Amino acid sequence: TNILAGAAVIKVLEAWGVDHLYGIPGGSINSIMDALSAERDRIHYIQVRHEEVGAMAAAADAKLTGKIGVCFGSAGPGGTHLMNGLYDAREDHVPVLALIGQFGTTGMNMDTFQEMNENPIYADVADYNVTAVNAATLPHVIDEAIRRAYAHQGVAVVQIPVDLPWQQIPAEDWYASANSYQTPLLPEPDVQAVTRLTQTLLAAERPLIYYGIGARKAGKELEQLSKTLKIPLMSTYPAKGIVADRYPAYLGSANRVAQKPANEALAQADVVLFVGNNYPFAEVSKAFKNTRYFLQIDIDPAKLGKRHKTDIAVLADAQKTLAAILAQVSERESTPWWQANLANVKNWRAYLASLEDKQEGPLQAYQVLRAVNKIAEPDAIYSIDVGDINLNANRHLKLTPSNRHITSNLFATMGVGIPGAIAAKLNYPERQVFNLAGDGGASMTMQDLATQVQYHLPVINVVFTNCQYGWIKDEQEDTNQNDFIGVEFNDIDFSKIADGVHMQAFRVNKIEQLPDVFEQAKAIAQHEPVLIDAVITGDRPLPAEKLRLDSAMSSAADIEAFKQRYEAQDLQPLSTYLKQFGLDD
Amino acid sequence: TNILAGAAVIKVLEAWGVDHLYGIPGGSINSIMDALSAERDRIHYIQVRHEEVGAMAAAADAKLTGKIGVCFGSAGPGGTHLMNGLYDAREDHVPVLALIGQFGTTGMNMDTFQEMNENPIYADVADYNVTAVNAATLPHVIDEAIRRAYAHQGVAVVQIPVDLPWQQIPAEDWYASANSYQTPLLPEPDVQAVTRLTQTLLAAERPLIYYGIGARKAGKELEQLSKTLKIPLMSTYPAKGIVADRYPAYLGSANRVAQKPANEALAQADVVLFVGNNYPFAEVSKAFKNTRYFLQIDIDPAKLGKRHKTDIAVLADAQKTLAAILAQVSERESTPWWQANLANVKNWRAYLASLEDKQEGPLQAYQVLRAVNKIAEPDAIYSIDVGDINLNANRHLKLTPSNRHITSNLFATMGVGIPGAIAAKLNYPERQVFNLAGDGGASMTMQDLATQVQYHLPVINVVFTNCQYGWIKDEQEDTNQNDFIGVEFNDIDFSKIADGVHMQAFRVNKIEQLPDVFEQAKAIAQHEPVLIDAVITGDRPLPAEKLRLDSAMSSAADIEAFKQRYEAQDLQPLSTYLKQFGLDD
Amino acid sequence: TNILAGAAVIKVLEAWGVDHLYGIPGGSINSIMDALSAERDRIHYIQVRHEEVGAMAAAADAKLTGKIGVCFGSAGPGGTHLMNGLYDAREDHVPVLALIGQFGTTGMNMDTFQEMNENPIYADVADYNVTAVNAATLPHVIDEAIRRAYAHQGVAVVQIPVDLPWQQIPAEDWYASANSYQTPLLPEPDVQAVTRLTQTLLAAERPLIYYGIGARKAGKELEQLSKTLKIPLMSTYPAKGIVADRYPAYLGSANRVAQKPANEALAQADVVLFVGNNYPFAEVSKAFKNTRYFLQIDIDPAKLGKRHKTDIAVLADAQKTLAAILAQVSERESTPWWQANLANVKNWRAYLASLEDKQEGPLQAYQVLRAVNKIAEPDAIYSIDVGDINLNANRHLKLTPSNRHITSNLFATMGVGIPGAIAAKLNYPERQVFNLAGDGGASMTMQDLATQVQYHLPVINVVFTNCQYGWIKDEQEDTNQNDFIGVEFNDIDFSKIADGVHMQAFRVNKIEQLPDVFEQAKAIAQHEPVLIDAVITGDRPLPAEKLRLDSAMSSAADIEAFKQRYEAQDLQPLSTYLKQFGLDD
Numbered sequence A, B, C: 001t002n003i004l005a006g007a008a009v010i011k012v013l014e015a016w017g018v019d020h021l022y023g024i025p026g027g028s029i030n031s032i033m034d035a036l037s038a039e040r041d042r043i044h045y046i047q048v049r050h051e052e053v054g055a056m057a058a059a060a061d062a063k064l065t066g067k068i069g070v071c072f073g074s075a076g077p078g079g080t081h082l083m084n085g086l087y088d089a090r091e092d093h094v095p096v097l098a099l100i101g102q103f104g105t106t107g108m109n110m111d112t113f114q115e116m117n118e119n120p121i122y123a124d125v126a127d128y129n130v131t132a133v134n135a136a137t138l139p140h141v142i143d144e145a146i147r148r149a150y151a152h153q154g155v156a157v158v159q160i161p162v163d164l165p166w167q168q169i170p171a172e173d174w175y176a177s178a179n180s181y182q183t184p185l186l187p188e189p190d191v192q193a194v195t196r197l198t199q200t201l202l203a204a205e206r207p208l209i210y211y212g213i214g215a216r217k218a219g220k221e222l223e224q225l226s227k228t229l230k231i232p233l234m235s236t237y238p239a240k241g242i243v244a245d246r247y248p249a250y251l252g253s254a255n256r257v258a259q260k261p262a263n264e265a266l267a268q269a270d271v272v273l274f275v276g277n278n279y280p281f282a283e284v285s286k287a288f289k290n291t292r293y294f295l296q297i298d299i300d301p302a303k304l305g306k307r308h309k310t311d312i313a314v315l316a317d318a319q320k321t322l323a324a325i326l327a328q329v330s331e332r333e334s335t336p337w338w339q340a341n342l343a344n345v346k347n348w349r350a351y352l353a354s355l356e357d358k359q360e361g362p363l364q365a366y367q368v369l370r371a372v373n374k375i376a377e378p379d380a381i382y383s384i385d386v387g388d389i390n391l392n393a394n395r396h397l398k399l400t401p402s403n404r405h406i407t408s409n410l411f412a413t414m415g416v417g418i419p420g421a422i423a424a425k426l427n428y429p430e431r432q433v434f435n436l437a438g439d440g441g442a443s444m445t446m447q448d449l450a451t452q453v454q455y456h457l458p459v460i461n462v463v464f465t466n467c468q469y470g471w472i473k474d475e476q477e478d479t480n481q482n483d484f485i486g487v488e489f490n491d492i493d494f495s496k497i498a499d500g501v502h503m504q505a506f507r508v509n510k511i512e513q514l515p516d517v518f519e520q521a522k523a524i525a526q527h528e529p530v531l532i533d534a535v536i537t538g539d540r541p542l543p544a545e546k547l548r549l550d551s552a553m554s555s556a557a558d559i560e561a562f563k564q565r566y567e568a569q570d571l572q573p574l575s576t577y578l579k580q581f582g583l584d585d
């Protein structure tokens, strides 16, 4: 006859298939806690040590599975702690439900303890942002929040006065709309548009296909188009792994979390096929300033001709359109453009291999990542924090379609490594999970290493300890007139942090220590989380956006300095390969 | 002839006497970093490990000194990390300037990396909230922000596109208005109002003076009025210390961070003088429902008759008005009301002493606080986190006018213990500083123990490890139908956390360990920070808002249970003393 | 080599096919005005007399053509005057671009004249809401705003510091992405789901098809499905006209802007096919409380299961789905349900005809609408204000697929009659255009009758002068305990208002005066606007939501009073027809 409104809210979550949710309790959210407590069998509550980790792990759930992530915070400071996770979900356009505690309706607007108007707090981050005021409609408001988060690929926020979830409502009135949920059946792209686009791509002398994560289902088509047509591939950093890194004509990504061949080739390309791509550096870096024809495939009308004046923009699914292109083309013989790029890639990979293959001496990030590679399972998931690690992981990890990797792509909040890995292990208990974090980002969320312990989540945490905000030190070196400030700091020993949260850990500072430590960690992570604190050097990684290798573009002094600093003596500029196969710039 | 707009901004900060500021650098704020770097001698930059600690320490600066606190965060996630500190400053009504990084004006609104419209983020927390768009007026905007933060006692926020602080502006144009800054000369309260108010207070049979921190300058007048007129004193929790805790007619505070005599007496009072007080539980707890006459002294017109229907509300300075009352009254003989309260206080203090004076056995919070008392200097400053520690510190610390104590009073964000203590030691290098934190709150900001080490801030950190959100577990016990959830969790060993950040530390779990550990910590904190991790029991502290001691109000079974749980066998209800001196309820 | 940024911005509007735009100039928007002035041969500026009319007309443009509407207002009060039209655009989900004046960047944040942080003002209404800060990127920010407004079907607001449009930018860098524009892809109906839906619909004893404007392309299919399957049709009020009103099994709309047969049939229906419909009354009115099965077709996943739990939900285009149902069914025999409804419709229309067909006496709204019908061209466009006119026009206008009618559907802002008619005449100079408005709503925007005169826009304005807010008077009658207040007021002679703005006009107060006045108006509007001020009675129109005709449900006294008041002696309840064909109510 009656049901507690709170019990009904949990039944809405269960109807939408929410497996786990994150938060920290408080008096202002104890009636939702009370309903969760009764439903421990069907929905798994994960108590975090800081609510931002809950919000970031919710976003990561959605990044990994496509299913809505769920978090909560108590009134006032519980909810405002969510913000870095919620902005991450907004900017990374993944569905997240955030519940916010509120004082009961009898005390709202009385200026009582921790009581404020919480609605304006969430207005900017949230696609849907409402304070519930009635128990009977509360299940519907939760259902509405979820349906909107999914439909609009963003954050829904609901402030809940704590009295409402303890009120009885009729048992037969509330429902969830999870049963109506479906994915659309999209039309095929028009043959005429696809044909026009194909002719332009094929007529190019120096073509590139430049994809982002909108092409995540088109890995097969991308690689086969490349091989058949002899057109090199480049991607956004997040799109790494869609085509295996092994692929000899994968150039990497452009800009700064970037690889030399992609930046060089992009500068030379006459035609770019830009697919499922919203590259944020397009305009500011003038990436397409020498491009003759810009062709686009995107599913979102908001993106059409967004990043560059577009000759042909096809509104369509990436995979369907790329498959449709593939169906109308056939073999082209190897071209000088193709051979020049292959040779350029080869030269670049040998450079990266020479960094990895050092056997003895002062530990660098490069050998640490090689050691990750050596213990990694073919379907490992990598949760990656924010800083030099993005650049290093982008160059060194050897990813294929079986892997996943996530970071905070656009909002780029430090601290995501720990919660991303928590979410990954909760969704995929049988898959190996890494957290690769710099010392700055790891220190921001370090308390939640305890959450991995408490819930027995066998994450392999690898902390890169340079005692710097390395990413920012290098920026200051490029722009700042005065001395470094705020970017070099005191050591934290993360093996001791790990010990404090009752997690097994190692600290290493020499290349020769890696094989045995990483072997131990692999084994430990069969049952329990582990941490490796890698004390690395302060060497600046090669800046792919500031290459000094080409005699025609840089002074001989500039080149010798760059080669020295970046151990880059055997790197050749793309122009060398262009000339080799009989082409100019 | 010219000056960098950034250099001028720092000169504005220096003109307003800003000694130190907190933040973490990023590319979007590196031009402000560049100006700070050149001015290291005259303004001290404190690099924190999480920007919320910077914001909380800025609020604490203002809490302690009355001078504007200053913090910053880089664009996107740097600034959103500030939020718990900024809401704390808003709710605690202290002046704070927050600078937010932004992408340069040429890339704003281009949807580039970490670039968004940041202005709506800060609209709710901030009294003044603006995006700067011109270098020439930037010093003025900073000056305007400061002047407004001070005038309105809140948060000013300025988003700064990173190009502006590197632009040249005329050297002679910009100025600071720090030279115009003054405190008002207030009138005296009218004699007639003071007289009317005094007659009503004196005619009462059961008077109380109930002050908050608006009476911080009136400690002397408060205690002398009490002694002369025989009127007991009670305060808000934050107003503890304004009159020495030793004072025999100080009752303590009401509600939950509360002491038994204050709650009991308040329930009996016929007349309350409510001074410099904005007690947020007034209405929700029906604190004044049996009060006959409610008299008020406040400096803010917004507060007049806010918390209860007010018979006489004098708009005036607390000290001036209390001194004016004192000047028109003289000695009254001891009354039964006075003696009953004194006896009630005595009984309560013996109870607290019996908890503190245990010498051997399972460690409780009570003996930990006695150990703090034993090593505390008479002018020590206490930065207090949020949870059971507020209740325990309120009962046990032996404070006088020479002390300071701060917490997050109204927003009540956990994690403030560490940053409050950092700010306290930076403002008062020669004064002993404690951070008293529960394990939940300490774990939220633990990474910034490293900041105390880096800057050689000899804080005494005392962590109360119950492996619970104790405050919330007890709430769940009171309200929740189903089992405890989210409030009991795994151990973190903070002596090992401290070791990881290179801070000397101890862990204790037995009463008999306290004297030697606290003696060592006292000595260590002559030169370096120290941490004591006190593993305490899960005993619930006596709930002053749920007393079961009075035969006329509770069942004999209820009383025996309460006496047993709370080691309260020798506590008597106020009514016993009322009857003793010949009064009824 | 260079172009003024303001010139480039107008070229972006031209590239996007903007024909006309509305607003009022000011110092803060004079550089956009300057650019507009040079471009007066290619884009047409419409000067309004109040900025809300500009914003409202921009919304109506989009409602009519699907082309983004464009309006502007100067800094401060110019922009805030836009709100009612911008909220109208958000709630009716149509693309509008709003440009807001702002002081130059050298004066922003100086607290100068009409200068303020304008961004927070538009945060709630806008899908995209930015302050421009750079001249070179300004064309892109405008291009971005338009593309988002279109993609997201809502409002984009750009605040423009007045200096930027007067700055020179490189002539060759800016572009518009209008060439790349596409409308979102239409999802396809699953064949098996459509088959399941059809079987449930065909098994129904009492089926209804209940469509909204999502089905505006499916009129042919709606009507043919109805005839073939013997299933009555009902619609939301805005969907009136998608199926010709003369169609015998069109019941009308439900709730209050409603027709008796729709409300009665919906109460009895066992199965509802709810298609392209977001009826906001569904839950609050319990429309579907006794519906056994609910079948939904909608393009938007956010709507699926929103208004009732679905038994079958199809995420697909309305016309494709309905075509697919029709393609798999054949002629059904008549059923008792079908006959009962057809007879109820005939009885209802005879009632409305009886009101329209009065030939002399005190003028009522019904005869005015009949006189509109008599002069209306088959493809007339109706801009309808808000109040009793929505209910009356819903019952009396005889519309077909050749007509258009618009109002403020959901925000339901009064005053839209005038601007909507202005926009209608601008987009369709060869079609007859009516503005049908109550005296309350016409009053709000009356000054912009001068805009119809100024631009020679031959609108037929008809004002229904009851000297009341009748819609609200009736609500007060229904709910209020004390006397009417604020709902009856002094006369305004709109024929004199019209005379004042130099528009030909008539005032009538008798039924017999209509034929000749309407003939004259019809003729005048071949070349110039005209106004008819119809002084009507204070008769309440029949409340379709409060029927008192069924003796099984209402007393004799209530039935008699209802018939007498609403001249409804000859109306029968649906149960009469249900019983005739052997079905119990």
Ligand SMILES: Cc1cc2nc3c(=O)[nH]c(=O)nc-3n(C[C@H](O)[C@H](O)[C@H](O)COP(=O)(O)OP(=O)(O)OC[C@H]3O[C@@H](n4cnc5c(N)ncnc54)[C@H](O)[C@@H]3O)c2cc1C
Pocket: A211, A212, A213, A214, A215, A235, A236, A237, A238, A239, A253, A254, A255, A256, A257, A258, A275, A276, A277, A278, A279, A280, A297, A298, A299, A300, A303, A316, A317, A318, A319, A386, A387, A390, A407, A408, A409, A410, A412, B113
């Ligand atoms: C420290 C740091 C530095 C960074 N710097 C770089 C850098 O130097 N280089 C770099 O490349 N990245 C960098 N990034 C990542 C970067 O900010 C952007 O997030 C990224 O480049 C955008 O990738 P995307 O276009 O794949 O993803 P998104 O921005 O998510 O875009 C996906 C696109 O695909 C479309 N789409 C989605 N589904 C489909 C479909 N089915 N069919 C067709 N289209 C579809 C979407 O509409 C959208 O346009 C960095 C990240 C960090 C943390």
Ligand SMILES: Cc1cc2nc3c(=O)[nH]c(=O)nc-3n(C[C@H](O)[C@H](O)[C@H](O)COP(=O)(O)OP(=O)(O)OC[C@H]3O[C@@H](n4cnc5c(N)ncnc54)[C@H](O)[C@@H]3O)c2cc1C
Pocket: A113, B211, B212, B213, B214, B215, B235, B236, B237, B238, B239, B253, B254, B255, B256, B257, B258, B275, B276, B277, B278, B279, B280, B297, B298, B299, B300, B303, B316, B317, B318, B319, B386, B387, B390, B407, B408, B409, B410, B412
């Ligand atoms: C976990 C937790 C629990 C808490 N629960 C309790 C509790 O149970 N009991 C309790 O007492 N507190 C409690 N609080 C603290 C509480 O929330 C309020 O912050 C506090 O009671 C308000 O104290 P106040 O009135 O002294 O300060 P404020 O709210 O800052 O008010 C100061 C008042 O003095 C006025 N004023 C300022 N200057 C002058 C002047 N010169 N002359 C005259 N008037 C002036 C101001 O206008 C204002 O009205 C708790 C805090 C925490 C962290």
Ligand SMILES: Cc1cc2nc3c(=O)[nH]c(=O)nc-3n(C[C@H](O)[C@H](O)[C@H](O)COP(=O)(O)OP(=O)(O)OC[C@H]3O[C@@H](n4cnc5c(N)ncnc54)[C@H](O)[C@@H]3O)c2cc1C
Pocket: C092, C211, C212, C213, C214, C215, C235, C236, C237, C238, C239, C253, C254, C255, C256, C257, C258, C275, C276, C277, C278, C279, C280, C297, C298, C299, C300, C303, C316, C317, C318, C319, C386, C387, C390, C407, C408, C409, C410, C412
């Ligand atoms: C004074 C006043 C009183 C009113 N009261 C009433 C009233 O009593 N009764 C009444 O009916 N109305 C009333 N309204 C109008 C009412 O508020 C709503 O706007 C209306 O009922 C909703 O109509 P709709 O569903 O047709 O439009 P919308 O709310 O615009 O919904 C259209 C739906 O169609 C979907 N859609 C769009 N395109 C497609 C496609 N190609 N295929 C499939 N689906 C598609 C959309 O996703 C959306 O769900 C009143 C208006 C006024 C001004």
Ligand SMILES: CC(=O)c1sc(CCOP(=O)(O)OP(=O)(O)O)c(C)[n+]1Cc1cnc(C)nc1N
Pocket: A385, A386, A387, A388, A389, A412, A413, A414, A437, A438, A439, A440, A441, A442, A464, A466, A468, A469, A470, A471, A472, B024, B025, B026, B027, B074, B077, B078, B081, B114
């Ligand atoms: C991208 C960005 O804005 C970066 S990268 C970075 C340095 C990360 O240091 P870490 O030690 O973790 O990595 P390292 O480079 O290997 O030393 C900072 C401070 N920021 C700015 C910043 C500031 N604060 C927060 C919460 N997030 C970000 N992204």
Ligand SMILES: CC(=O)c1sc(CCOP(=O)(O)OP(=O)(O)O)c(C)[n+]1Cc1cnc(C)nc1N
Pocket: A024, A025, A026, A027, A074, A077, A078, A081, A114, B385, B386, B387, B388, B389, B412, B413, B414, B437, B438, B439, B440, B441, B442, B464, B466, B468, B469, B470, B471, B472
């Ligand atoms: C007051 C309030 O809302 C409290 S007190 C408290 C427990 C503190 O636990 P700790 O271990 O630090 O202390 P203990 O009681 O001694 O065990 C919580 C979670 N909350 C809610 C809450 C949640 N999250 C944050 C950031 N701040 C608050 N205040």
Ligand SMILES: CC(=O)c1sc(CCOP(=O)(O)OP(=O)(O)O)c(C)[n+]1Cc1cnc(C)nc1N
Pocket: C385, C386, C387, C388, C389, C412, C413, C414, C415, C437, C438, C439, C440, C441, C442, C464, C466, C468, C469, C470, C471, C472
């Ligand atoms: C629906 C709604 O919210 C209505 S309908 C109505 C009365 C309309 O009076 P009018 O004389 O124009 O029409 P009449 O009924 O024919 O007398 C009002 C005041 N309101 C509230 C209201 C107030 N103000 C504005 C701008 N818009 C609305 N919708």
Ligand SMILES: [Mg+2]
Pocket: A438, A439, A440, A464, A465, A466, A467, A468, A469, A470
């Ligand atoms: Mg680092």
Ligand SMILES: [Mg+2]
Pocket: B438, B439, B440, B464, B465, B466, B467, B468, B469, B470
């Ligand atoms: Mg605790």
Ligand SMILES: [Mg+2]
Pocket: C438, C439, C440, C464, C465, C466, C467, C468, C469, C470
């Ligand atoms: Mg009217």
Ligand code: NA
Pocket: A050, A443, A444, A445, A446, A447, B050, B443, B444, B445, B446, B447
């Ligand atoms: Na932290």
Ligand code: NA
Pocket: C050, C443, C444, C445, C446, C447
């Ligand atoms: Na007006």
